[PDB]
Design a protein around this nucleic acid. Structure first.
Length: 87
DNA sequence: CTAGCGACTAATTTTTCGGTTCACGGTCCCACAACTAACGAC
């Protein structure tokens, strides 16, 4: 049975994350490049966004919701770096 | 040789910034990898 990637993420199978990563990696990279200008920090934030999606995988309800989550989170990460004294 | 004589120091409190968390609609040159057309063997 070929379940959709939403149910693979819900099950607890790590290859699901490979699927969502390979699908939305470049979109999240573009989202980050829109808000910042440091590719290093953008890549770090993309990794954090996907890992935090995996951690909060017990909070998704819709197949599209996953995508929304990613975009949302990634944006706010960029936003937080406007306030960090270190950065 | 000797004697008379002319107010600072210690204890307690209070407050601004950072951390954390939540998280949907040009050029020229020298090598290196393909690569293919022809050539030779089973």
């Amino acid at each position: 049975m070929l379940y959709s990637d939403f149910e693979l993420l819900k099950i607890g199978d790590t290859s699901a994350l490979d699927h969502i990563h390979a699908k939305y990696f470049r979109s999240i990279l573009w989202i980050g490049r829109q808000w910042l200008n440091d590719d290093f920090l953008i890549e770090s934030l993309v990794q954090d966004t996907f890992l935090k999606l995996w951690v909060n995988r017990d909070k998704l309800e819709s197949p599209e919701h996953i995508f929304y989550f990613l975009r949302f989170v990634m944006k706010r990460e960029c936003i937080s770096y406007y306030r960090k004294p270190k950065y």
